[PDB]
Symmetry: C3
Subunit: 88 residues, 3 copies
């Protein structure tokens, strides 16, 4: 068995976010040009994927966290992480 | 066990496509700014990844669907999904 | 069981790189507009993800290769692949 990761990046610095599903929990490591740090994202899941887009200089991120057949969408728009009503 | 997903997005609306491998079948959920809907993509696979690029406002998508060691490339270019001749190795 | 892939792309040609974890080894298939070929990337891993960004016309790629709880970051910036000091948590 191994952990399962997902990655996204933006700009040219770059900024990078790496998500890791490990024993039913997803955590986040972050690079903004000056070291890797532990990010605010921490939610349940056995599987993770991610996508992101910029609106001007502001990053928007969607993290799809799945356990069993249930997928939860987590949303970042600059002010914290919230789960949406997204339902597979 | 759990399902396995892959996601891609484009533009600033944005549009998002989320692919889910579940019991050997990959399906697709779609967002173009006005609700989530079930997409046209439905193909066999135990594993899925995706990438996409824009040419102007036209989206192009490649979905890599795997079973065993066999990886099949599915292509969207505005007018349906088609399997390419892509092979692993 | 099945292989596990990750994909990235850039520009409008486009270029595409597909990474596959297969029996503890990750390999790479490449498209630059003129056929699929086996890429330089070949490293151990049971799981792979990837991201890339352009700086002008130069592609930069990070591949995250995991075995157990150990994740290795492999870096391409035009001159070959090297591992960084990236350590999970
Ligand atoms: C996208 C977001 O990134 C981190 O959020 C932290 C936020 O970090 C960033 C900032 O340092 C960077 O240079 C550019 O933008 C980002 O938003 O910074 C604030 C403090 O200003 C907090 O530390 C945020 O946690 C992650 O922690 C988030 O989970 C998310 O990935
Ligand atoms: C990329 C494509 O998206 C869906 O295709 C549907 C298509 O949707 C899109 C459109 O509504 C959007 O605003 C921009 O581009 C797309 O083409 O719209 C037609 C009706 O106009 C059908 O609904 C298509 O199914 C998915 O269903 C496809 O699988 C694919 O992801
Ligand atoms: C990004 C890189 O791509 C391959 O590297 C090969 C390199 O390929 C590219 C070139 O042919 C293309 O038109 C645009 O840029 C790329 O860098 O070409 C050199 C010799 O010219 C070698 O063939 C490199 O191997 C992969 O092999 C790398 O692993 C990586 O994905
Ligand atoms: C881009 C969209 O952002 C919000 O409206 C979310 O609630 C949606 O589920 C989608 O991710
Ligand atoms: C970008 C390229 O598009 C088509 O030519 C496909 O047949 C290739 O396999 C590749 O995806
Ligand atoms: C963008 C950064 O590039 C190098 O500095 C690496 O050592 C980092 O881990 C990161 O990927």
């Amino acid at each position: 068995s191994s952990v399962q990761t997902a990655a996204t990046s933006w700009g040219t610095v770059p900024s990078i976010r790496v998500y890791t599903a490990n024993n039913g929990k997803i955590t986040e490591r972050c690079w903004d040009g000056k070291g890797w740090y532990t990010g605010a994202f921490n939610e349940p899941g056995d599987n993770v994927s991610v996508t992101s887009w910029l609106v001007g200089s502001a990053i928007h991120i969607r993290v799809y966290a799945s356990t069993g057949t249930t997928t939860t969408e987590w949303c970042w728009g600059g002010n914290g992480w919230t789960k949406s009503a997204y339902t597979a």
